[PDB]
Design a protein around this ligand. Sequence first.
Ligand SMILES: [Cl-]
Ligand SMILES: [Cl-]
Ligand SMILES: [K+]
Length: 164
Amino acid sequence: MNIFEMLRIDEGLRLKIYKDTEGYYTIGIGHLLTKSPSLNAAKSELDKAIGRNTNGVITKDEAEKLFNQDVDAAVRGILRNAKLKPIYDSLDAVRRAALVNLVFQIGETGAAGFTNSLRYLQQKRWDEAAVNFAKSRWYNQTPNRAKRIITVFRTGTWDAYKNL
Ligand SMILES: [Cl-]
Ligand SMILES: [Cl-]
Ligand SMILES: [K+]
């Protein structure tokens, strides 16, 4: 198990433009195209992203290319965010992956907004962090996924992704 396999489990893989849990145009492995309700606008972002005139459908290889970029970007951003870097540095590799996952899903801003939960993580108060994380729109809108992430933050093990 690793960040790529983990996010591949959580985001799935679709080669045609689809809408994410929030209703936004996405493709590949959770690659958000735009928040716009315009399909054309999403298609234009996709073409820009891939570098070719696509027609809304991409190859697996292309999808993975975007995904690698996305993961890398998620990590890069964590490292440039003063609210998150210290948390990230304080964690072991498995818990860091959970944090990357969260940021990939909700964005840096959204993630850095979990100030109190992050602080408990920093203090290594596992169970308390877990309880706290659940008190959020994030958890309520995507409870299955949030549960998984939370268990990883709580235990520092990949058990929750074992079997998916
Ligand atoms: Cl991009
Ligand atoms: Cl979910
Ligand atoms: K998805």
